[PDB]
Amino acid sequence: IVGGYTCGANTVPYQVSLNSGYHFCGGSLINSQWVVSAAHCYKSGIQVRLGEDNINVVEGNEQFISASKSIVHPSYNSNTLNNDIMLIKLKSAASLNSRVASISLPTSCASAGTQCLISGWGNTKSSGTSYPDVLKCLKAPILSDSSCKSAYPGQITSNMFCAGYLEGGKDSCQGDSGGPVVCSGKLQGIVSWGSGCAQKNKPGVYTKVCNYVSWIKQTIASN
Template sequence: MRSLVFLVLLGAAFALDDEKIVGGYECKPYSQPWQVSLNSGYHFCGGSLVNENWVVSAAHCYMSRIEVRLGEHNIVITEGSEQFIYSDKVIRHPNYNSWTLDSDIMLIKLSKPATLNQYVQPVSLPTGCATAGTNCSVTGWGNTMSSTADSNKLQCLEIPILSNSNCNNSYPGMITNTMFCAGYLEGGKDSCQKGESLSMDRRNKKEEEGKKEEEEEGEKEEEGKKEEEEEGGKKEEEEEGEKEEEGKKEEEEEGKKEEEEEEEEDKEWKYLMKFEQQS
């Protein structure tokens, strides 16, 4: 399951007239079923379906009336998987600043619920902030070259989340606490698009967590076995010690018996000697 970790790539904020995915590839058809195309007679922005009634996108993509196209792969042909639904409400974040692009986020309420199927599915919302170095996928219909022609087929690109320090160094004085960066500092792969989604595959994280849990369980089992062996060894030592103590006790008792027998013999000898002397 994928989780939407960011909605508008930072690059879009500073290159709005150069929409493109550079270094990406064509997505497997319908592998990103939450991806939507925002239309006003033409594709102008992307967005992400978060449930059957709502889409999230960038506030700088605002139009008062938007046609939301779901289930798309090739946006210039009809493939039979599409759903076209108009917006009922378009709501920009109240703190959105068109100059700094702070709080650049927007909600679109659909005029009717989307039909969820193999082509149309919502993306999971994040439960926390992704850490620097986490690989994420950015998807959208961008320009794959420097020309103005948009890519017709949905494009994918894997990029890492950057640290706040690298982000601020790249865009000094431009980063607010509502933003973070993703991409490669050396260039070559980037996305300068409007409203496209940046998502993280939580299954990989769960698999890694599962592996870690298995390793921890294995370590616990090994520790448990070691403790059992140590306890078993201690028990054996204690039993051997008890046996030695019992053996010593038996020897002492036998020694006492021998001493008592010797004392009895001495008494008998003394009595006999005394009897002989008297007779």
């Protein structure tokens, strides 16, 4: 997260860190046994890390649970990042409390102008690299489909939305992908892609979660 703020320990209780020997992606807990992430976060040997603040120190609220199954969206295209969504089943159910909690799925799609919360352990610099240890947050609005399409000609599908600031300076970044975009307590987006970070007219691009609720519910109900 570039130009964000320190969330505060366990203040984003649904935020998970996907670890394969190191943090490589964010995720969102949607029930005690399932995490929602980006399909580009797919890999073998994922350990889901819940209740994290500092991802480099055991602070006492973590739950480390290996993934038993990963389900990439059947229509994910890694070249266009269309349908950039994946489900991860936990080997054991997470113990839910105030610090480790599921995030509700949307009942409807959030509009442009809706204020959301984006969070993650991604790079905090727009030029250069600095990975934070603690969870970073960014309050950002959803951008109109027209401004999103104008920023990224020929790249925005009906399964994507932009959020952030066209003036730049505040964006998600390397390491935040897979993580949440939560608006009014609903998971509306997954950190997906961009062109650099916090650059003018290049806001972050997010997977449009409301388009996947039926697939998520059906998948959970059968796996």
